[PDB]
């Protein structure tokens, strides 16, 4: 899947970068636990337009 990260991941990236992962990785680990969101156009717009400042605010 194409996903947008919600946090730091060692080999993927961090804090809003769009990166393609294997479908099982996104479906079973990241998305259910909130570490990323599927990179739909609506999801990307909703993430970047508003919420991103607080997402950056949480350092740890």
């Amino acid at each position: 899947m194409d996903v947008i990260l919600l946090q730091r991941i060692k080999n993927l990236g961090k804090l809003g970068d769009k990166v393609s992962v294997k479908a099982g990785y996104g479906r079973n680990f990241l998305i259910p636990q909130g570490k990323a969101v599927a990179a739909t156009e609506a999801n990307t717009a909703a993430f970047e337009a508003r919420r991103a400042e607080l997402e950056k605010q949480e350092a740890e």
Partner: protein, 78 residues
């Protein structure tokens, strides 16, 4: 109560085995069905669905919440 995909409605279909001598015998094609647990955040719970890999791809493309709402609209207990 059957081998039916909850997302797509896929179910076994009939066909033929065709040998090299062209003998034909009845067979069925079965869907790639399995059970899968999906996290539903709006309801804070796992939902267990019997679905195909194509249904999983549909859920990947459309989001779990939209698919669950559509099944409820069709009248399924999810």
């Amino acid at each position: 109560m059957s081998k039916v995909c909850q997302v797509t409605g896929k179910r076994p279909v009939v066909g033929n085995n065709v040998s090299h001598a062209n003998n034909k015998t009845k067979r069925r094609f079965e869907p790639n069905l399995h059970h899968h647990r999906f996290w539903l955040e709006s309801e804070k719970r796992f939902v267990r669905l019997r679905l195909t890999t194509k249904g999983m791809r549909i859920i990947d493309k459309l989001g779990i919440e939209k698919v669950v709402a559509d099944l409820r609209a069709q009248g399924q207990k999810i």
